[PDB]
Each structure stands twice: as structure tokens, then as C-alpha cells.
Coordinates of C-alpha atoms in Angstrom, one line a residue:
Chain Z
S19 CA 117.5 97.6 79.9
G20 CA 117.7 100.8 81.9
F21 CA 117.9 101.4 85.7
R22 CA 115.6 103.7 87.7
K23 CA 114.9 104.5 91.3
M24 CA 111.8 102.3 91.5
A25 CA 109.3 102.3 94.2
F26 CA 106.8 99.6 95.1
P27 CA 103.2 100.0 93.8
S28 CA 101.4 101.9 96.5
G29 CA 97.8 100.7 96.1
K30 CA 97.9 98.3 99.1
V31 CA 99.1 101.0 101.4
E32 CA 96.7 103.7 100.0
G33 CA 93.8 101.7 101.3
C34 CA 95.2 101.9 104.8
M35 CA 95.7 105.7 105.1
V36 CA 93.4 107.7 107.4
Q37 CA 93.4 111.2 109.0
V38 CA 93.7 111.6 112.8
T39 CA 92.8 114.9 114.5
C40 CA 93.2 115.8 118.2
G41 CA 92.3 119.4 119.0
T42 CA 93.6 121.5 116.1
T43 CA 96.4 119.1 115.2
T44 CA 95.9 116.8 112.2
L45 CA 98.2 114.1 110.8
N46 CA 98.1 110.7 109.1
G47 CA 97.3 107.3 110.6
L48 CA 97.6 103.7 109.4
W49 CA 94.4 101.6 109.6
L50 CA 95.0 97.9 109.8
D51 CA 92.3 95.5 111.0
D52 CA 90.6 97.5 113.8
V53 CA 93.6 99.6 115.0
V54 CA 94.8 103.0 113.7
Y55 CA 98.5 103.6 114.3
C56 CA 99.7 107.3 114.4
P57 CA 102.5 109.4 115.9
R58 CA 101.8 110.4 119.5
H59 CA 102.5 114.0 119.0
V60 CA 99.0 114.4 117.6
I61 CA 98.0 115.1 121.2
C62 CA 100.5 118.0 121.6
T63 CA 99.5 121.7 121.6
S64 CA 101.9 124.7 121.1
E65 CA 102.9 124.5 124.8
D66 CA 103.9 120.8 124.4
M67 CA 106.5 120.9 121.8
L68 CA 109.8 121.2 123.7
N69 CA 109.3 118.9 126.8
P70 CA 105.9 117.2 126.5
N71 CA 105.1 114.6 129.0
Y72 CA 103.1 112.3 126.7
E73 CA 101.8 110.1 129.6
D74 CA 100.3 113.2 131.2
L75 CA 99.0 114.6 128.0
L76 CA 97.3 111.3 127.1
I77 CA 95.6 110.6 130.4
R78 CA 93.7 113.9 129.9
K79 CA 92.1 112.6 126.7
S80 CA 89.0 110.5 126.1
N81 CA 88.3 108.3 123.1
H82 CA 86.0 110.9 121.6
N83 CA 88.8 113.5 121.6
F84 CA 90.3 111.6 118.6
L85 CA 88.6 112.2 115.3
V86 CA 89.6 109.5 112.8
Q87 CA 88.4 110.0 109.2
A88 CA 88.7 107.3 106.5
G89 CA 87.8 109.1 103.2
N90 CA 84.5 110.7 104.0
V91 CA 83.6 108.2 106.8
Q92 CA 84.3 108.9 110.5
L93 CA 85.6 105.9 112.4
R94 CA 84.5 105.7 116.1
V95 CA 87.4 105.3 118.5
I96 CA 86.6 102.8 121.3
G97 CA 90.0 102.6 123.0
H98 CA 93.5 104.1 122.9
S99 CA 96.9 103.2 124.2
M100 CA 100.5 104.5 123.7
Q101 CA 103.4 102.2 122.7
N102 CA 106.7 104.0 122.7
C103 CA 106.3 107.0 120.3
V104 CA 103.0 105.8 118.6
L105 CA 99.4 105.8 119.6
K106 CA 97.2 102.8 118.9
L107 CA 93.5 103.8 118.4
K108 CA 91.1 100.9 118.5
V109 CA 88.2 101.6 116.2
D110 CA 84.8 99.9 115.9
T111 CA 85.3 98.7 112.3
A112 CA 88.0 96.6 110.8
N113 CA 89.5 98.0 107.6
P114 CA 88.2 95.8 104.8
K115 CA 91.2 96.8 102.6
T116 CA 93.7 95.5 105.2
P117 CA 96.5 93.7 103.2
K118 CA 98.5 90.8 104.5
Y119 CA 101.2 92.7 106.4
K120 CA 104.1 92.6 108.9
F121 CA 105.9 95.1 111.1
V122 CA 109.7 95.0 110.6
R123 CA 112.6 97.0 111.9
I124 CA 115.1 97.6 109.2
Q125 CA 118.9 98.1 109.3
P126 CA 120.8 101.1 108.0
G127 CA 121.5 100.8 104.3
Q128 CA 118.2 99.0 103.6
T129 CA 115.7 100.8 101.2
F130 CA 111.9 101.2 101.2
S131 CA 109.2 103.1 99.5
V132 CA 107.4 106.1 101.1
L133 CA 103.8 107.1 100.4
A134 CA 103.8 110.7 101.4
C135 CA 100.3 111.7 102.6
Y136 CA 98.5 114.8 104.0
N137 CA 95.2 114.8 105.7
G138 CA 95.0 111.0 105.1
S139 CA 95.3 111.3 101.3
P140 CA 98.3 110.4 99.2
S141 CA 100.6 113.0 97.5
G142 CA 103.1 110.6 95.9
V143 CA 105.5 107.7 96.2
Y144 CA 109.3 107.6 96.2
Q145 CA 112.1 105.3 97.2
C146 CA 114.2 106.0 100.3
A147 CA 117.2 104.5 102.1
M148 CA 117.8 104.3 105.9
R149 CA 121.1 106.3 106.1
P150 CA 124.0 105.0 108.3
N151 CA 123.2 107.8 110.7
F152 CA 119.5 106.6 110.9
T153 CA 118.1 109.6 109.1
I154 CA 116.3 109.5 105.8
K155 CA 116.5 112.0 103.0
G156 CA 112.8 112.3 102.3
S157 CA 110.4 114.8 100.9
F158 CA 108.0 115.7 103.8
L159 CA 106.1 118.9 104.7
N160 CA 104.2 119.8 107.8
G161 CA 101.3 117.4 108.2
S162 CA 103.1 114.5 106.6
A163 CA 103.7 112.7 109.9
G164 CA 102.2 109.3 110.0
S165 CA 103.1 108.6 106.4
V166 CA 104.8 105.2 106.2
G167 CA 107.6 103.5 104.5
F168 CA 107.3 99.9 103.3
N169 CA 108.5 97.0 101.2
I170 CA 106.2 94.5 99.4
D171 CA 107.1 90.8 99.1
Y172 CA 104.8 88.7 97.0
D173 CA 101.5 89.8 98.6
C174 CA 102.8 90.9 102.0
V175 CA 103.3 94.5 103.0
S176 CA 106.3 94.9 105.4
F177 CA 105.8 98.3 107.1
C178 CA 109.2 99.5 108.4
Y179 CA 108.9 103.3 109.0
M180 CA 106.4 105.9 110.3
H181 CA 107.4 109.5 109.7
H182 CA 107.6 111.9 112.7
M183 CA 109.8 114.9 112.1
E184 CA 112.4 117.0 110.2
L185 CA 115.9 117.8 111.5
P186 CA 117.2 121.4 111.0
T187 CA 119.5 120.1 108.2
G188 CA 116.4 119.1 106.2
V189 CA 116.6 115.3 106.7
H190 CA 114.0 113.2 108.3
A191 CA 113.5 111.0 111.4
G192 CA 110.8 108.5 112.4
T193 CA 110.1 105.2 114.1
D194 CA 109.3 101.6 113.3
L195 CA 105.6 100.6 113.7
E196 CA 106.2 99.7 117.3
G197 CA 107.1 103.4 118.0
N198 CA 110.8 103.0 118.5
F199 CA 112.8 105.8 116.8
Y200 CA 115.5 104.9 114.4
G201 CA 118.6 106.7 115.7
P202 CA 119.2 108.8 118.8
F203 CA 116.3 111.0 118.3
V204 CA 113.2 112.0 120.3
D205 CA 109.9 113.6 119.5
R206 CA 110.8 117.0 121.0
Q207 CA 111.5 120.2 119.1
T208 CA 114.9 120.6 120.8
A209 CA 118.1 120.9 118.9
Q210 CA 119.1 117.4 117.8
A211 CA 121.8 116.4 115.4
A212 CA 122.6 113.1 113.7
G213 CA 126.0 111.5 113.6
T214 CA 128.1 112.3 110.5
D215 CA 126.6 110.4 107.7
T216 CA 128.6 108.0 105.5
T217 CA 128.2 106.3 102.1
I218 CA 126.6 102.8 102.0
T219 CA 129.5 100.9 100.4
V220 CA 127.7 97.6 99.7
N221 CA 125.0 99.5 97.8
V222 CA 127.5 101.4 95.6
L223 CA 129.0 98.0 94.7
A224 CA 125.6 96.6 93.9
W225 CA 124.9 99.6 91.6
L226 CA 128.2 99.1 89.8
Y227 CA 127.1 95.5 89.2
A228 CA 123.8 96.9 87.8
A229 CA 125.9 99.1 85.4
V230 CA 127.8 96.0 84.2
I231 CA 124.6 94.0 83.8
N232 CA 123.3 96.9 81.7
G233 CA 126.3 96.7 79.4
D234 CA 128.9 99.2 80.7
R235 CA 132.4 98.3 81.8
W236 CA 134.4 101.4 81.3
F237 CA 135.2 101.9 85.0
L238 CA 136.7 98.4 85.7
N239 CA 140.5 97.9 85.9
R240 CA 142.9 95.0 86.0
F241 CA 143.6 95.1 89.7
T242 CA 142.3 93.3 92.8
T243 CA 142.5 94.3 96.5
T244 CA 142.4 92.7 99.9
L245 CA 139.3 93.5 101.9
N246 CA 141.6 95.1 104.5
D247 CA 143.2 97.4 102.0
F248 CA 139.9 98.3 100.4
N249 CA 138.4 99.3 103.7
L250 CA 141.5 101.3 104.6
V251 CA 141.1 103.4 101.4
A252 CA 137.3 103.6 101.3
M253 CA 137.2 104.9 104.9
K254 CA 139.2 107.9 103.8
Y255 CA 136.3 108.9 101.5
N256 CA 133.7 108.6 104.3
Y257 CA 132.5 105.1 103.1
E258 CA 131.1 102.5 105.5
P259 CA 133.2 99.4 106.2
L260 CA 132.5 96.5 103.9
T261 CA 132.1 93.2 105.8
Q262 CA 132.4 89.6 104.8
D263 CA 128.6 89.4 105.2
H264 CA 128.4 92.1 102.6
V265 CA 130.8 90.2 100.3
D266 CA 128.6 87.1 100.6
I267 CA 125.4 89.1 99.8
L268 CA 127.0 90.3 96.6
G269 CA 127.7 86.7 95.6
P270 CA 124.7 86.4 93.1
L271 CA 125.6 89.6 91.3
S272 CA 129.3 88.6 91.2
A273 CA 128.3 85.2 89.7
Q274 CA 126.0 86.7 87.2
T275 CA 128.6 89.1 85.9
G276 CA 131.8 87.1 86.3
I277 CA 133.4 89.9 88.3
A278 CA 134.8 88.9 91.7
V279 CA 133.6 91.2 94.5
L280 CA 137.2 92.2 95.5
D281 CA 137.8 93.1 91.8
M282 CA 134.8 95.3 91.9
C283 CA 136.2 96.8 95.1
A284 CA 139.4 97.6 93.1
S285 CA 137.2 99.4 90.5
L286 CA 135.5 101.5 93.2
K287 CA 138.9 102.4 94.7
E288 CA 139.9 103.9 91.4
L289 CA 136.6 105.6 90.8
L290 CA 137.0 107.4 94.2
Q291 CA 140.6 108.4 93.2
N292 CA 139.6 109.7 89.8
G293 CA 136.0 110.7 89.7
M294 CA 134.1 110.1 86.5
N295 CA 136.0 112.6 84.3
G296 CA 133.0 113.8 82.4
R297 CA 131.4 110.4 82.1
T298 CA 128.2 109.0 83.8
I299 CA 127.2 105.6 85.2
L300 CA 123.6 104.6 84.7
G301 CA 122.8 108.3 84.1
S302 CA 124.5 109.6 87.3
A303 CA 127.6 111.7 87.8
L304 CA 127.8 110.6 91.4
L305 CA 128.3 107.1 92.9
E306 CA 124.8 106.0 93.9
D307 CA 124.3 104.2 97.3
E308 CA 120.5 103.8 97.6
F309 CA 120.1 100.6 95.7
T310 CA 120.7 97.3 97.7
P311 CA 121.9 94.1 96.1
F312 CA 118.3 92.8 96.3
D313 CA 117.0 96.0 94.6
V314 CA 119.4 95.4 91.7
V315 CA 118.3 91.8 91.3
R316 CA 114.6 92.8 91.6
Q317 CA 114.9 95.4 88.8
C318 CA 117.2 93.5 86.4
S319 CA 115.0 90.3 86.8
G320 CA 111.5 91.8 86.8
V321 CA 110.2 90.6 90.1
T322 CA 106.4 91.4 90.6
Chain I
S7 CA 118.2 125.2 115.2
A8 CA 115.2 123.2 116.3
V9 CA 113.6 119.9 115.2
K10 CA 110.2 120.3 113.5
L11 CA 107.5 117.8 114.5
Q12 CA 105.5 117.3 111.3
Chain N
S3 CA 111.6 120.1 102.9
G4 CA 113.5 117.7 100.6
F5 CA 113.1 117.0 96.9
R6 CA 112.7 113.5 95.4
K7 CA 111.7 112.0 92.1
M8 CA 108.1 111.5 93.1
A9 CA 105.6 109.3 91.3
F10 CA 101.9 109.5 91.4
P11 CA 100.1 107.0 93.7
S12 CA 99.5 104.0 91.5
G13 CA 96.5 102.3 93.1
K14 CA 94.0 103.5 90.6
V15 CA 96.1 102.1 87.7
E16 CA 97.1 98.8 89.5
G17 CA 93.4 97.7 89.3
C18 CA 93.5 98.1 85.5
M19 CA 96.4 95.8 84.6
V20 CA 95.8 92.4 83.0
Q21 CA 97.8 89.8 81.2
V22 CA 97.2 89.2 77.4
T23 CA 98.5 86.0 75.8
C24 CA 98.2 85.1 72.1
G25 CA 99.9 81.9 71.1
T26 CA 103.3 81.9 72.8
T27 CA 103.5 85.7 73.2
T28 CA 102.6 87.3 76.5
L29 CA 102.4 91.0 77.5
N30 CA 100.3 93.3 79.6
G31 CA 97.0 95.0 78.8
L32 CA 95.0 97.9 80.2
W33 CA 91.4 97.0 81.2
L34 CA 89.0 99.9 81.2
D35 CA 85.2 99.5 80.9
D36 CA 84.7 96.3 78.8
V37 CA 87.9 96.8 76.6
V38 CA 91.5 95.6 77.1
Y39 CA 94.1 97.7 75.2
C40 CA 97.4 96.2 74.4
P41 CA 100.3 96.4 71.9
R42 CA 99.5 94.9 68.5
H43 CA 102.7 92.8 68.4
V44 CA 101.1 90.3 70.9
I45 CA 99.9 88.6 67.7
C46 CA 103.5 88.1 66.5
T47 CA 105.6 84.9 66.9
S48 CA 109.4 85.2 67.2
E49 CA 109.6 84.5 63.5
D50 CA 107.1 87.3 62.6
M51 CA 109.0 90.2 64.2
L52 CA 111.4 91.4 61.5
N53 CA 108.7 92.7 59.1
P54 CA 105.3 91.7 60.4
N55 CA 102.2 92.3 58.3
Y56 CA 99.9 93.0 61.2
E57 CA 96.8 93.1 59.0
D58 CA 97.4 89.6 57.8
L59 CA 98.5 88.3 61.2
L60 CA 95.2 89.6 62.7
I61 CA 92.9 88.3 60.0
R62 CA 94.1 84.8 61.0
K63 CA 93.0 85.3 64.6
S64 CA 89.7 84.7 66.3
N65 CA 88.4 85.9 69.7
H66 CA 89.3 82.6 71.3
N67 CA 93.0 83.1 70.2
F68 CA 93.3 85.8 72.9
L69 CA 93.6 84.8 76.5
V70 CA 93.1 87.6 79.0
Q71 CA 93.8 87.0 82.7
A72 CA 92.8 89.6 85.4
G73 CA 94.4 88.2 88.5
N74 CA 93.3 84.6 88.3
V75 CA 90.0 85.3 86.6
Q76 CA 89.8 84.7 82.8
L77 CA 88.0 87.4 80.8
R78 CA 86.4 86.0 77.7
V79 CA 87.2 88.0 74.6
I80 CA 84.0 88.8 72.6
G81 CA 85.4 91.1 70.0
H82 CA 88.7 92.4 68.6
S83 CA 90.0 95.2 66.4
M84 CA 93.2 97.1 65.8
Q85 CA 93.5 100.9 66.2
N86 CA 96.9 102.0 64.9
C87 CA 99.6 100.0 66.9
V88 CA 97.2 98.8 69.6
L89 CA 94.6 96.1 69.8
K90 CA 91.3 96.7 71.4
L91 CA 89.8 93.4 72.9
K92 CA 86.2 93.6 73.9
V93 CA 85.6 91.4 76.9
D94 CA 82.6 89.9 78.7
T95 CA 83.4 91.7 82.0
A96 CA 83.5 95.5 82.5
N97 CA 86.3 96.4 85.0
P98 CA 84.6 97.2 88.3
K99 CA 87.7 99.2 89.3
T100 CA 87.7 101.5 86.2
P101 CA 88.8 105.0 87.5
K102 CA 87.7 108.3 86.1
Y103 CA 90.1 108.5 83.1
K104 CA 91.0 110.0 79.7
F105 CA 93.4 109.3 77.0
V106 CA 95.9 112.2 76.3
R107 CA 98.8 112.6 74.0
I108 CA 101.7 114.5 75.6
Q109 CA 104.4 116.6 74.2
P110 CA 108.2 116.4 74.6
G111 CA 109.3 117.6 78.0
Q112 CA 106.2 116.4 79.9
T113 CA 106.6 113.9 82.6
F114 CA 104.6 110.9 83.7
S115 CA 104.6 108.0 86.2
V116 CA 105.2 104.5 84.8
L117 CA 103.7 101.4 86.4
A118 CA 106.1 98.7 85.2
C119 CA 104.3 95.4 84.9
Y120 CA 105.0 91.7 83.9
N121 CA 102.4 89.0 83.4
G122 CA 99.7 91.6 84.3
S123 CA 101.2 92.2 87.8
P124 CA 102.6 95.6 88.7
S125 CA 106.3 95.4 89.5
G126 CA 107.3 99.0 90.4
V127 CA 106.6 102.7 89.8
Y128 CA 108.9 105.5 88.6
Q129 CA 108.9 108.9 87.0
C130 CA 109.8 109.4 83.3
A131 CA 110.0 112.3 80.9
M132 CA 109.2 112.3 77.2
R133 CA 112.6 113.3 75.8
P134 CA 112.8 115.9 73.0
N135 CA 113.7 113.0 70.6
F136 CA 110.5 111.2 71.7
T137 CA 112.2 108.4 73.5
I138 CA 111.9 107.6 77.3
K139 CA 114.7 106.5 79.6
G140 CA 112.8 103.7 81.3
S141 CA 113.5 100.4 83.0
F142 CA 111.8 97.7 81.0
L143 CA 112.6 94.0 80.3
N144 CA 111.0 91.5 78.0
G145 CA 107.4 91.1 78.8
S146 CA 106.9 94.7 80.0
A147 CA 105.1 95.9 76.9
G148 CA 101.6 97.1 77.7
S149 CA 102.8 98.9 80.8
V150 CA 101.4 102.4 80.9
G151 CA 102.4 105.9 81.8
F152 CA 100.0 108.3 83.4
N153 CA 99.4 111.5 85.3
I154 CA 96.6 112.3 87.8
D155 CA 94.6 115.5 87.9
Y156 CA 92.5 115.3 91.1
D157 CA 89.7 112.9 90.1
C158 CA 91.0 111.8 86.7
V159 CA 93.7 109.5 85.5
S160 CA 95.2 110.7 82.2
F161 CA 96.8 107.8 80.4
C162 CA 99.5 109.1 78.0
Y163 CA 101.9 106.2 77.3
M164 CA 101.8 102.5 76.5
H165 CA 105.1 100.8 76.3
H166 CA 106.1 98.8 73.2
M167 CA 109.8 98.3 72.7
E168 CA 113.5 99.0 73.4
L169 CA 115.9 100.7 70.9
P170 CA 119.4 99.4 70.4
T171 CA 120.8 102.2 72.6
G172 CA 118.8 101.0 75.6
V173 CA 116.1 103.7 75.6
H174 CA 112.4 103.0 75.1
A175 CA 109.6 103.8 72.7
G176 CA 105.9 103.4 72.7
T177 CA 102.5 104.9 71.8
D178 CA 99.7 106.9 73.1
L179 CA 96.6 104.9 74.1
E180 CA 95.2 105.3 70.6
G181 CA 98.2 103.5 69.2
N182 CA 100.1 106.4 67.7
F183 CA 103.8 106.2 68.2
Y184 CA 105.8 108.9 69.9
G185 CA 108.8 109.6 67.6
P186 CA 109.9 108.3 64.2
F187 CA 109.8 104.6 65.1
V188 CA 107.9 101.5 63.9
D189 CA 107.1 98.3 65.8
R190 CA 109.4 95.8 64.1
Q191 CA 112.8 94.4 65.1
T192 CA 115.1 96.4 62.8
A193 CA 117.9 98.8 63.5
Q194 CA 116.3 102.2 64.3
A195 CA 117.9 105.3 65.8
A196 CA 116.4 108.3 67.6
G197 CA 117.6 111.8 66.9
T198 CA 120.2 113.4 69.1
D199 CA 118.6 114.3 72.3
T200 CA 118.6 117.7 73.9
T201 CA 118.0 119.0 77.4
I202 CA 114.6 120.3 78.5
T203 CA 115.4 123.8 79.5
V204 CA 112.1 124.8 81.1
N205 CA 112.3 121.8 83.3
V206 CA 115.9 122.6 84.4
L207 CA 114.6 126.0 85.4
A208 CA 111.7 124.5 87.3
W209 CA 114.3 122.3 89.2
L210 CA 116.4 125.4 90.0
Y211 CA 113.3 126.9 91.5
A212 CA 112.8 123.7 93.5
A213 CA 116.4 124.1 94.8
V214 CA 115.6 127.7 95.9
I215 CA 112.5 126.6 97.7
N216 CA 114.7 124.0 99.5
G217 CA 117.3 126.5 100.6
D218 CA 119.9 126.2 97.8
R219 CA 120.7 129.6 96.5
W220 CA 124.5 129.4 95.9
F221 CA 124.0 129.4 92.1
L222 CA 121.9 132.6 92.2
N223 CA 123.8 135.6 90.9
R224 CA 123.3 139.4 90.4
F225 CA 123.6 139.2 86.6
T226 CA 120.8 139.6 84.1
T227 CA 120.1 138.3 80.6
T228 CA 117.6 138.7 77.8
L229 CA 115.6 135.7 76.5
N230 CA 117.4 135.8 73.1
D231 CA 120.9 136.1 74.7
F232 CA 120.1 133.1 77.0
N233 CA 119.0 131.0 74.0
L234 CA 122.2 131.7 72.2
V235 CA 124.1 130.2 75.1
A236 CA 121.6 127.3 75.6
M237 CA 121.9 126.0 72.0
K238 CA 125.7 125.9 72.3
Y239 CA 125.2 123.3 75.2
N240 CA 122.4 121.3 73.4
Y241 CA 119.6 122.8 75.4
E242 CA 116.1 123.2 74.0
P243 CA 115.0 126.8 73.2
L244 CA 113.2 128.6 76.0
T245 CA 110.0 130.1 74.7
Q246 CA 107.8 132.9 76.1
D247 CA 105.2 130.3 76.8
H248 CA 107.8 128.5 78.9
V249 CA 108.6 131.8 80.6
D250 CA 104.9 132.1 81.4
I251 CA 104.5 128.6 82.7
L252 CA 107.2 129.4 85.3
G253 CA 105.1 132.3 86.6
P254 CA 103.8 130.6 89.8
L255 CA 107.3 129.4 90.9
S256 CA 108.7 132.8 90.0
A257 CA 106.1 134.5 92.1
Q258 CA 106.5 132.0 95.0
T259 CA 110.2 132.5 95.2
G260 CA 110.6 136.2 94.2
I261 CA 113.1 135.3 91.5
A262 CA 112.3 136.6 88.0
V263 CA 112.5 133.9 85.3
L264 CA 115.2 135.8 83.4
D265 CA 117.3 136.0 86.6
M266 CA 117.0 132.2 86.9
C267 CA 118.2 132.1 83.3
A268 CA 121.2 134.1 84.2
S269 CA 122.0 131.6 86.9
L270 CA 121.6 128.7 84.5
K271 CA 123.8 130.4 81.9
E272 CA 126.7 130.7 84.4
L273 CA 126.2 127.1 85.5
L274 CA 126.5 126.0 81.9
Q275 CA 129.7 128.1 81.2
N276 CA 131.5 127.3 84.5
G277 CA 129.9 124.2 86.0
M278 CA 129.2 123.5 89.7
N279 CA 132.8 123.7 90.8
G280 CA 132.6 120.4 92.7
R281 CA 129.3 121.3 94.3
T282 CA 125.8 119.7 94.0
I283 CA 122.2 120.9 93.7
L284 CA 119.6 118.9 95.4
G285 CA 122.0 116.0 95.8
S286 CA 122.9 116.0 92.1
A287 CA 126.1 116.8 90.2
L288 CA 124.1 117.1 86.9
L289 CA 121.4 119.7 86.0
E290 CA 118.2 117.7 86.2
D291 CA 115.5 118.2 83.5
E292 CA 112.8 115.6 84.3
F293 CA 110.8 117.8 86.7
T294 CA 108.1 120.0 85.1
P295 CA 107.0 123.3 86.7
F296 CA 103.8 121.5 87.9
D297 CA 105.8 118.6 89.3
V298 CA 107.7 121.0 91.5
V299 CA 104.5 122.7 92.8
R300 CA 102.7 119.4 93.4
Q301 CA 105.6 118.1 95.5
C302 CA 106.5 121.3 97.4
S303 CA 102.9 122.2 98.2
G304 CA 101.7 118.7 99.2
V305 CA 99.0 118.3 96.6
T306 CA 97.0 115.1 97.2
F307 CA 94.9 112.7 95.1
Chain D
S9 CA 121.7 95.6 67.4
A10 CA 118.0 95.8 66.4
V11 CA 114.9 97.1 68.3
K12 CA 113.5 94.6 70.7
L13 CA 109.7 94.3 70.9
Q14 CA 109.0 93.7 74.6

């Protein structure tokens, strides 16, 4: 029993973290086989933060202008290239701790773990969701760029996020590992704002199923709803539309608990109307939306 | 306000 | 900026987790040096668990009755003994990945990272606090006993918790790594209840400081309070007594933010008497008490390991 | 219920 915001074990990612310095700028890189991936703004100076031309900044650099440190060992850079918003630094040694891995681009509403690092060393690990507006609500300070987000499946690390920057509202933005930003953001210190964020409906429903699995039913009611009427109501509370694909994805949890998805939808409609009235659900006084249906099954079934 | 590259 | 429930990096501990099987019972063990530590109820069968006589169950066992698997490598057990509620299994192979470590016993209110494991394989990591009633609000299924809780201090992993069991209320209980239970519980399958829990006041104040560091000041007010007056209000709401030692531990956060500890107490008092008025603090509608003052500093200053 | 040894 119990339900916690659980991250993946970080060991396999720890063994890939290095430090990259160009000039006086230092951030983190990811060392897989003989390539180090890092955010391209490591080549910026103080004159290059509003409108950097990264092609022009990079052509002025030689391999030996990049200092890569893995623990207390310097790695010699023997080539460099830019791919979208990331640099790829070829080094003369393959990382012997390279796990089996994949680069994936995730969708809004999917979760992942973050290993927050500074100067190539880890600070801690936490669980994140890609918000509908393509930001993440992380915990990142100056120097954390190049920290990564990831999922582990069996023995395979799926890297899905590289951290770049913080928006003025305090939320975070970054790229996939091919250097394409999530969202309509760019690596410039101009004013940029995300779309209005919304609540991840399919995740809230998964979490309500988790609460039932854990033995709590107080919030259910005798009603059902059409998908149409559910979405008309939920939208009024700034919730994301629920699709038939989402309904299908909730099938396993529905079958495990005996509660039809549209009956859980009717529960959620009443929770939004009423609030919790001094009660909590799985220890929270708000409706939680950063667990996916897979996260719930993983944690209530003990996947390792 | 401005974005901060980290 | 931002504030998250942040666990320690787990790599040093992942390398220490093994599977221990005795008969039909399987759980996890912690492999350090040439010893594997695990809960003593691994020697129980399902019929032995209402009132096990662990002394007699263990006399009946030989080294070969314990199967220890480290990944897919079998570690031969060459000695066994019981220390309180843990077994110590001497093995033929010292763990080459043993980190710098110590065993520590923590006090209520202190936090730690849990590496939840099944069949000797790490499943996930999350933060926990030892509650004032000596339970932890974990996430643990059958087979998770022998999972450990830890903190890191630079070079040294400090192991403070080994998981044993789940109470009827769904909260969890375990021991230190010398096998001494936290709280008034015993390892048998009987009805047992923890004392009524209370809120860890010093941690709530740390979390309010974290909110200030992150630009949340709406709850700050111009009122003042004495330590004694605050405590009189705290007890009415089931909060632990704030002590002077707690006031002192909050020094660095108080000096960082320029808010006196007693002024943060005045803010908390008003939060307790009037609520949040439909507002949130750091994304939460409840007052959070599972961050210690040091947890706040390690996160907000980017301490690494 | 009773305590569950895990």
C-alpha cells in the first residue's frame, strides 16, 4: 500500500554525466559511447544572450576550446558539430558505463525522472511531467543546463529531455536529445511566455484509480456521463480534453477496479464541483495530474 | 521579464 | 528556481541490493563488505508469521538454506547470525561496489531517500520522513522488505532504515540497520496500531522558508509571537512543539532570507487559524512537513554528491 | 486487519 511520486533509480544516468566548459561558461553534458551531448549555449558569452548566431559563434571555436571533464579525468575532444539546439562533442574515449539507451521525444502529459546536476555531478532526482504547454515544473538553478530527463524500461534508458533554461514564471524549458525544443521556445534571453497551462485529465483519472486500488472510494457517486458531457464540463475547469484513446488507455485500471471509465469521469465532475471538503486523496488536497496510467500500474504492481 | 539560460 | 520532493542520487545504493531466499520466502538484502543484511522474517513460512519464535526457526537453518543472488551471480553463504530483527549473512564475495558508508539511527522528523526494491532489483526512489509516531508513509508491496532508506553526506552513505512491514492503516514500519525497530511495533502478523501522528513543525517552517526563497511571500505578515505563545497555538492543531534547538537549526535559512524564525512562526500561526483562503504554497494546498532545514538548503543551493 | 510482513 501507499502511493508516492516515485522516480527511476538514477545510477545508470549518473555514470553518463560530465562537465563541459567553453570560456568561462560551464554546464553539464551527457556522455554516451564516444559522444558528449550538451546545450549549445555553452559557447555563449555575455554579449551572446539575446540574439546569438550560434553558427557564427561555433565556427570560431576549435576542438581544444571545449574542456570536458568526467570526474577527475579530462576527455579530449576530437570533433564537434551542432544539431538543432545541442552540441555533439566527439571524444577520444567511449564511456565504459554507457547503458543500453534510446533517444525519444515524449508527448505532453507523459512523465519522466530528472537527475539535476551541477558541474557534472548529481544533486538529486525527482519526477516531472511534460505540461500541456510544453513546460516542466522542475527544480533547476544556474548551471543545471544539460541535466537530463529519462525513463527506464527493463535495462534500457530512454532519454527524453535535456534542460536549457528557466522562464520568468519559474517553470522550465528544454529539448529532446536531438536538440529540438519542446514548445514554442528558443535559447535566447528574450521575453517568452508559454500557452496557458491546463490540467492533464487522463492522469487525474489514473490517480483516482490508484486511490481506489489503495482502498478509498469516498469520492465515487452513482452517476455516469457521456464523454461529450464530461468534456464540456471539465473544459470549464481548464482541464484537457479526454479522448477515446485516453479511455482505451485507462482500460486496464478500469478492469482491475470494476469502475467504468465514464463512471470515474462522473466522480471527477463531482470532485471539481465540490472540492474535497476537508478530506484528502492519497495524501493530497488537490487533484494530482503527474501520474500516467502506466505510472499507476508500475507502482501498484512493483515493476523493477 | 527575460528567460534565463541556465 | 522551483521546489520538488528531491531524493538523493541512488547509484551508490543500487550496487548494494541483492535477493535473499529462504525456503519459499523471498525479500531483499543489503550487501556491504562480505555481509548481507536482511529482515529476520525471511526464515518464516506463511504458517510461521502469527507468533514466530525466531530463535527456534533459525536454529533449524544451515548456511545452505539461504540463497543470495546478486544480479545473476550466486553468493555462497558461509556464516549466519541474528542481530535484533535482522539477519547477517556472511558470504564468500565482498561487494566490490561497497561505498563509503555508516549505519545511523535517525530521530522523528528526519527525512531519507528510499530505494524500493523487489527480487533484489531497484524499482524506484522517493523521499520519506520518519513520522513522530515512528511510522513512514511509504509505497511498499509484498516482497519489498529489505529495501533501505539512506542519506548522503558528501562521500558517505548513511543507512538509516530497513523496511519490514505494513500496518493495517497502510503505513509502514521497519528498523535501523542493526535491527532495532523504530516505534512500538514487533515483526509478527498481529493487529498493531501506531500512536496518533502529529505534524513536524520545524519542517513546516523550513518549507515556508523554501517558499520565500522561491518568491512566495503572501503568507508573511507584520505580526510577532513568542516561542511559548506559538507552541500554545501549535498543540491545538496537533503540531509538534517547536524547541529552541529547532529555532537554532533554522538559523541558516533565517539568515539567507532575512526573516526571523519567530516571524515565520507568526506567519504559520495565522495559516493555522485562517487557512490559505483557496491559495497554494509551492503548488500545495496543505502545509508540507517532510522537508528538513537541510533538505531545503541542499536543493536551493545545488549541493552535489 | 493485521500487520503484513513484506
